[PDB]
Design a protein around this ligand. Structure first.
Ligand SMILES: [Br-]
Ligand SMILES: [Cl-]
Ligand SMILES: [Cl-]
Ligand SMILES: [Cl-]
Ligand SMILES: [Cl-]
Ligand SMILES: [Cl-]
Ligand SMILES: [Cl-]
Ligand SMILES: [Cl-]
Ligand SMILES: [Cl-]
Ligand SMILES: [Cl-]
Length: 404
C-alpha cells in the first residue's frame, strides 16, 4: 500500500492533493490490485475520487477478483460515488470472476436509487452470473421488491435463465416471496418454465406447501400435472410432504390423482411411504385408485406396510384395499411387514384377512423371511398360523421409490 492508497481510503483530501501535485500517480503498479480509486469508492470519499479522476485515475481498473471501483461504489449503495464514476466513464457491464456487475450487487443490497442510476446509464440487465443469474434473479432471491419493479418497468427479461433453467419466478417461489411472484406473472413470468429437472414453479410452491403462491400460479395457467424428468407432478410433491390443504387445492384444479411417475408411483403411494393419513383421506375421498400399482406391482398397502405407519395401513384397509395383493414377484403386504419386522402390522394384516401361506417368486413365505432376519416377535405370530414347508431351500423386496 502506497501513501496514496492510505490517503484515498482515509479520506484525506489535503494529502491526496499534495501527493498528486508532488508527482504521485493514481495507478502505480501495472498488475491488478485495488487502486487508490477503488479505496476511494468503498469509503465513499467523493472529493478524493473527484480528484483522482481529475488526475488520470483509471475508472475501469480491475482488482484481484476483477471487480472495478464502480463495483465497490455500488455494494455500498452510494448513488453519488456512482453517478460520478459513471459521469466519468466507468463501464457498468464489466464482470467479476463470478460474473457480477455493479447492477447485481446494487440489486442484492436493494439499493434502489443506485440501481436506477445504473440503468439510466446503459447498465445491462441481461448480464449473467456464472450461477446463471440476472439482476432480477438476485432481486427475487433477497426479496427486494421495488428493485424488481423498477427492473421490470425497464425491459428486464421476465424469465431469462442460465444452464440450470431457473427463471426469476423459480427463485422467487423458492425463497417464498409472494410480493415478487404476483409482480412477475403480469409482466410475463411463465408458470411453465422447466428447470434442469423439469421442475416448474408450481412444483416448488407445492412441495414447500405455499398455498398462497400456488393459487396465483394456477390462476395464470400453470399445470398441476407438469412432469419433472422423473415424471413427478406438483401433486406428488405436495402429497409426499403431507401438505393436505394443498393436495386439496391441486386436485380441485384438474390435478390427475392417478398419474404416476417414471416407475409407477401414484401420490397415494408416496403418501403411504411417509404415512400422512389426512392426505391419504383427501385423495381416497376424491376417488383415487386405492390399490393403484407400481410397475413392479406394489400397492399403497404394500408400501404402507413395508415402511412404518400402521395407522395408514388401517385406513387403506378400511377403504377396502386388497390385503392379499401380490407383486409381480409374489410379494404381498405381509412379506413386507415381515421383512421389515413390523409385528403390529403382521398382527393387523393377518387379522384383516391376509394370507400367511403365500410362497413368493423366490421361495419365501412371510414366516421364512421373519425367520432369516431374526425378527423374533414376528416369527412368533407367523409361526402359529403359517403352514407346512412342503419343501425347503437371499433375495429381498423393496417398493420403488423416487430418486434425487
Ligand atoms: Br393472482
Ligand atoms: Cl480505465
Ligand atoms: Cl448516494
Ligand atoms: Cl438450487
Ligand atoms: Cl435459487
Ligand atoms: Cl434446492
Ligand atoms: Cl422471503
Ligand atoms: Cl401399473
Ligand atoms: Cl422400515
Ligand atoms: Cl408409514
Amino acid at each position: 500500500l502506497t501513501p496514496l492508497h492510505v490517503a484515498s481510503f482515509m479520506g484525506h483530501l489535503p494529502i491526496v492533493k499534495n501527493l498528486l501535485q508532488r508527482g504521485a500517480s493514481p495507478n502505480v503498479s501495472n498488475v491488478k490490485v485495488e487502486t487508490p480509486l477503488h479505496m476511494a469508492a468503498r469509503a465513499g470519499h467523493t472529493e478524493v475520487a473527484k480528484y483522482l479522476l481529475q488526475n488520470k485515475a483509471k475508472v475501469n481498473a480491475k482488482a484481484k477478483d476483477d471487480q472495478t471501483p464502480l463495483h465497490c461504489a455500488a455494494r455500498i449503495g452510494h448513488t453519488n460515488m456512482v453517478k460520478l464514476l459513471l459521469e466519468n466513464n466507468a463501464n457498468p457491464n464489466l464482470a467479476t470472476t463470478a460474473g457480477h456487475t455493479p447492477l447485481h450487487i446494487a440489486a442484492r443490497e436493494g439499493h434502489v436509487e443506485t440501481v436506477l442510476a445504473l440503468l439510466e446509464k446503459e447498465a445491462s440487465q441481461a448480464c449473467m452470473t456464472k450461477k446463471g443469474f440476472t439482476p432480477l434473479h438476485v432481486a427475487a432471491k433477497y426479496g427486494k421488491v421495488r428493485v424488481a419493479e423498477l427492473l421490470l418497468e425497464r425491459d428486464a427479461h421476465p424469465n431469462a435463465a442460465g444452464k440450470n433453467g431457473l427463471t426469476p419466478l423459480h427463485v422467487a417461489v423458492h425463497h417464498n416471496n409472494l410480493d415478487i411472484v404476483k409482480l412477475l406473472l403480469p409482466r410475463g413470468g411463465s408458470p411453465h418454465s422447466p428447470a434442469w429437472n423439469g421442475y416448474t414453479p408450481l412444483h416448488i410452491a407445492a412441495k414447500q406447501n405455499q398455498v398462497e403462491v400456488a393459487r396465483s400460479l394456477l390462476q395464470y395457467g400453470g399445470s398441476a400435472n407438469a412432469e419433472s424428468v422423473q415424471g413427478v407432478t406438483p401433486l406428488h410433491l405436495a402429497a409426499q410432504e403431507g401438505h393436505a390443504e394443498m393436495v386439496a387445492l391441486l386436485l380441485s384444479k384438474q390435478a390427475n390423482g392417478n398419474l404416476g411417475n417414471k416407475s409407477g408411483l401414484t401420490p397415494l403411494h408416496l403418501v403411504a411411504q411417509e404415512g400422512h393419513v389426512p392426505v391419504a383421506d383427501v385423495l381416497i375421498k376424491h376417488g383415487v385408485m386405492v390399490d393403484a400399482t407400481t410397475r413392479m406391482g406394489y400397492t399403497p398397502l404394500h408400501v404402507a406396510s413395508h415402511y412404518g405407519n400402521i395407522k395408514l395401513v388401517k385406513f387403506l384397509l378400511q377403504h377396502q384395499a386388497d390385503v392379499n395383493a401380490k407383486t409381480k414377484l409374489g410379494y404381498s403386504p405381509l412379506h413386507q411387514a415381515a421383512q421389515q419386522g413390523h409385528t403390529d402390522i403382521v398382527t393387523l394384516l393377518l387379522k384383516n384377512g391376509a394370507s400367511p401361506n403365500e410362497v413368493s417368486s423366490d421361495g419365501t413365505t412371510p414366516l421364512a423371511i421373519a425367520k432369516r432376519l431374526g425378527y423374533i416377535s414376528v416369527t412368533d405370530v407367523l409361526k402359529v398360523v403359517t403352514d407346512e414347508t412342503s419343501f425347503v431351500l437371499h433375495r429381498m423386496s423393496f417398493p420403488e421409490t423416487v430418486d434425487e
